[PDB]
Design a protein around this ligand. Structure first.
Ligand code: HEC
Ligand code: HEC
Ligand code: HEC
Ligand code: HEC
Ligand SMILES: Cc1ccc(N)c(C)c1
Ligand SMILES: Cc1ccc(N)c(C)c1
Lengths: 294, 108, 294, 108
């Protein structure tokens, strides 16, 4: 029967100038709603949403992945256990109503892309063609990484997402955006000062901040800094593992190297499980709101 | 001046939920990722007493008053490129009208 | 020595894309501070500002107009025809600092064009090249019309602006936007329900409402309707005069015609006194925010 | 629910400036440029008596709830093409939440 084949089918009569409009609507709503989560913005929750829906992918049976966009169905997410993402969705469906022609998968993939570029991040090529598939396909959770694990778990997990050491250290750079909410995951606190700005501060803190193993009120252990910063054990595992420790120090010295790598990785993650027919156009590169005078 | 001021209350959150992670408000305050922000009005483009500072900002050496520095928080990379000030920002005139009022008073 | 010759020279290395940046900045700030004047916005005052500037033109000796764009002090804003315009200048100078390369006249005219289009009006072609001048070029008071006159006054006044009968009934339709202010002009109230949406309500309300002469708190007379509306004596003269009345009814039955003729009239108004070279670019038709996805 | 709850005290001030001129609220309200807004939640579109609606307003026959309302109020001509309601549209979700919060109680 072979693993599933998800083929990118572009929305009808839709080109670059259409998805740029959607991009803009996302980016402006980011700027209109700045009071979310003690003035952090919907930036972080949108980058996580894209990661989470692209993270259920399984290269062995080609199940899950961003293509499906089946995540609007309730069976998908338990809510909680993956808590915090219900805000990411409540941010997008008015934009889904402004543009009812775009597929769900395309939407919160673009939102994940729009969020980064607006948060001073690198420019990430994005593609259209992901199609909603709730019928017969609703990826069960438990496919997503636990927080309390280590470098062995991370490495063996991301190979399922077809990611090598370099890619997963790059994608972990996103954990400089936002914070952990104790009410959602069981961990509390940010791991950086700039929570709404895409930088390399992540790799800097790991190597330059001192960390103590501390319990939180949710009884789970974590690494906490003197500055008030924190890290997940999965994040802290990256300085524990020598192969991971090498790549970490590189992005700490060169931020531009990280921007090029995150772009390559984060795009790959979004396009995982999708076979693009050769008649499909080159990946879009969207202009930000700043370079449009806005 | 041409730039109004806001209430002395609401944006006190906008210093603690927004600018607290870097800037301190007290006399001789301990330096963080940002310098001790006090006496800022009437002082220079990055005095930064006892704190690491790139050349990219004292470039201008322009005083920080209510007027000249209203483009300071709208887009940092725009008014002083190559800097290390990285923050989300605010795009409405009210919030800028606000935060100055507390660092016009508590920064005396 | 012949009347003053004003040649339109574009700023150094400027094009279409550069000006939409300013347009977008204006259109956005128009949306941001929407609390001004009890949620009417800066829409009307920007339109009026453009009118008042262009309204200083004299076709006899070619003085005034929007070319020079050089007046910072219309004898101070308190008593004469210009009261309330100082709020429009305060809207523009923060936009003028991020675009110090743009001229005053262009920023004054474009700001007028931007407001009309953003208030769902017609598409109004705009041109660049206005150059600033020194002190001895400053137009003065007494150039603009008084509110309480008759149709004979309006006719002979707009002659100086090179505007015929049809071209003034079109422009007076702009008085569907905003309201009169007693603190400013000496007249109080709106002449319509939609003050921040460009329509033909001005012409419908004019001959479908019941108007009665009444004295406001500034002891000036005006035409009020029982729906709470008001019309300047100059406005009401447009139905008193038969030649004007025929056109008023026309725009009342056809809004699409009114939009078409307003654009030609408004563009002409903002372009009076300008000599455009032949190697100059074609007029600009800018994209609105709603077209860019906003 | 997807929409949030705002303030009727700053939702009424938003009504007195942007809606009150075209719409009334209380029982037996006089028909202005727009119809009387009472019992609008739970009734179909253009079903209030004694008012002349455009076809397009009645044709969609949507049932006004607290969410699809905010969709119509951000772009009145986009949600119902051909409507004769002339309104710029609310672009701030707060303004939409605050107003509907007021409209929910004002229109009980
Ligand atoms: C906030 C500023 C506003 C709210 C909230 C509503 N309006 Fe209006 N309104 C106006 C007209 C001419 C109509 C009828 C249009 C047509 O039938 O095609 C309406 C209608 C509504 C409705 C729909 C009611 C129904 O379908 O039964 C709602 C929910 C509504 N209005 C709420 C006129 C105007 C207007 C004139 C200048 C303004 C500023 C507003 N409306 C603004 C609001
Ligand atoms: C870090 C996460 C910051 C946030 C959030 C804000 N600021 Fe900032 N500030 C930061 C740094 C790293 C620096 C200077 C260091 C360098 O090398 O450039 C500053 C500096 C300022 C200054 C000028 C200081 C001086 O001596 O002239 C001002 C006036 C200032 N910061 C204000 C400010 C405001 C109003 C903020 C929020 C609304 C804000 N900062 C956020 C770091 C960070
Ligand atoms: C490419 C992006 C990306 C990847 C890959 C990623 N995350 Fe995250 N994650 C985010 C973002 C962005 C946030 C911040 C969300 C917020 O602040 O609400 C986040 C937050 C979290 C949170 C806290 C959420 C909350 O509401 O408290 C947990 C737990 C978490 N991540 C676990 C993981 C683990 C474990 C891995 C891998 C082993 C991982 N994530 C990989 C983007 C990512
Ligand atoms: C093309 C545009 C245009 C033309 C032509 C025009 N006006 Fe207006 N005028 C406006 C707008 C828009 C307003 C509303 C300003 C506001 O609401 O702040 C206004 C307002 C006014 C006001 C009141 C301002 C206040 O603050 O109360 C007066 C007085 C006035 N106009 C006089 C005139 C007269 C007299 C004429 C012609 C005989 C004229 N204008 C022609 C656009 C125009
Ligand atoms: C800055 C940051 C972002 C995300 C997460 N999960 C953490 C712990 C820190
Ligand atoms: C609707 C309106 C707007 C402005 C002015 N000036 C008048 C008379 C009516």
């Amino acid at each position: 029967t072979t693993p599933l084949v998800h083929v990118a089918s572009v929305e009808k009569g839709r080109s670059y100038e259409d998805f740029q409009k959607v991009y803009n609507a996302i980016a402006l709503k980011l700027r209109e709603d700045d009071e979310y989560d003690n003035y952090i913005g919907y930036g972080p929750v949108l980058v996580r949403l894209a990661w989470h829906i692209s993270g259920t992918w399984d290269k062995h049976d080609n199940t899950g992945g961003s293509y499906g966009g089946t995540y609007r169905f309730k069976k998908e997410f338990n809510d909680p256990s993956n808590a915090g993402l219900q805000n990411g969705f409540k941010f997008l469906e008015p934009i889904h109503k402004e543009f009812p022609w775009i597929s769900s998968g395309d939407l919160f993939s673009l939102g994940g892309v729009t969020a980064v570029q607006e948060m001073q991040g690198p420019k990430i090529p994005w593609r259209c063609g992901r199609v909603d598939t709730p019928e017969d396909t609703t990826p069960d959770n438990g496919r997503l990484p636990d927080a309390d694990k280590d470098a062995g778990y991370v490495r063996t997990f991301f190979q399922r997402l077809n990611m090598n050491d370099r890619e997963v250290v790059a994608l972990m750079g996103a954990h400089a955006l936002g914070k952990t909410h104790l009410k959602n995951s069981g961990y509390e606190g940010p791991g950086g000062a700039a929570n709404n700005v895409f930088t390399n501060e992540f790799y800097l803190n790991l190597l330059n901040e001192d960390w103590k193993l501390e319990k939180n009120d949710a009884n789970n252990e974590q690494w906490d800094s003197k500055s008030g910063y924190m890290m997940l054990p999965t994040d802290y595992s990256l300085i524990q593992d020598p192969k991971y420790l090498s790549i970490v120090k590189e992005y700490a010295n060169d931020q531009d190297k990280f921007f090029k790598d995150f772009s390559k990785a984060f795009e790959k993650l979004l396009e995982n499980g999708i076979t693009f027919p050769k008649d499909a156009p080159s990946p879009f590169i969207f202009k930000t709101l700043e370079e449009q005078g806005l | 001046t041409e730039f109004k001021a806001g209430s002395a209350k609401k944006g006190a959150t906008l210093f603690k939920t927004r600018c607290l992670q870097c800037h301190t408000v007290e006399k001789g305050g301990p330096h963080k990722v940002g310098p001790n922000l006090h006496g800022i009005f009437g002082r220079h483009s990055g005095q930064a007493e006892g704190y690491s500072y790139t050349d990219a900002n004292i470039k201008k050496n322009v005083l920080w008053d209510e007027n000249n520095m209203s483009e300071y928080l709208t887009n940092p990379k725009k008014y002083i490129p190559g800097t290390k000030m990285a923050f989300g920002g605010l795009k409405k005139e009210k919030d800028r009208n606000d935060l100055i009022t507390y660092l016009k008073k508590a920064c005396e």
